[PDB]
Amino acid sequence: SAEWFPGQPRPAHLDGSSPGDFGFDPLGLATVPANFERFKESEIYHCRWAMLAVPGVLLPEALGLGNWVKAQEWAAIPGGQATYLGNPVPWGNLPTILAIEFLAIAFAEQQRTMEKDPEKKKYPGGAFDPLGFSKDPVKFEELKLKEIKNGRLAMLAFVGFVVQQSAYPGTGPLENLGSHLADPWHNNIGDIVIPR
């Protein structure tokens, strides 16, 4: 049966030996295998960026440098100059930041999609696995599962960050945790869910 919903039948196109398949596909968006492979790749790509982004949202706020939202305010000021760890960035000019980012990232992401092997498309080797951990396929698959799980848990956390930011303008992630710890029985989602 379906692992995500105990007592529920598995989908016809699912139940295969996939890294993270729990039989969850209510809308049946994965009927065509050619769409399914690219959905797997897209899932891996969203997971990795979210996992890499979570510390980048939690660390500067915890170091007293401004939450992840206020760090983008200097770009909206005409004379705004970038700062990093309190050290002003000499090249903090907005046009060059918007230019070199596009110019470099376009090439860096154009290179990766010229690959034609679907299995190697999700997981390349070479200069991306320096220490090397594919020596044992069983532990390789185990690590793949333990990676996709943390990636889904990280995407959930980022969406939570966005929604909690929208609920309390001007605040940060860890500030909400501190407020919750201050008054557990009075500071919860109940006020927003049931508004006064």
Binding site: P95, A99, L103, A106, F107, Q110, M114
Partner: protein, 94 residues
């Protein structure tokens, strides 16, 4: 701030993007998009003014870069250059 530098830099970056970054995608999507009417191209159907010009399309560049491509990416270069050159004195525009 200096137009004679901004325009040159923008044109150079646009030409680099055209020749080395998005060349394959453009040249492979172009092959699949040929206008036709009732299963035949415009020149095959009878239009004598729809012949594709041959002199201007050939080039000795290793990848086939030509004059039409030069103009296509140079136009982007000038447009972006004058976009940056306008929202500097005072421009609140998208």
């Amino acid at each position: 701030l200096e137009p004679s530098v901004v325009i040159s830099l923008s044109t150079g970056l646009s030409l680099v993007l055209g020749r080395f970054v998005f060349f394959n995608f453009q040249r492979e999507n172009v092959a699949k998009q040929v206008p036709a009417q009732n299963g035949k191209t415009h020149f095959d159907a009878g239009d004598v003014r729809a012949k594709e010009f041959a002199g201007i399309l050939k080039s000795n560049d290793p990848v086939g870069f030509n004059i039409v491509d030069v103009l296509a990416w140079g136009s982007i270069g000038h447009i972006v250059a004058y976009y940056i050159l306008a929202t500097t004195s005072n421009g609140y525009d998208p």
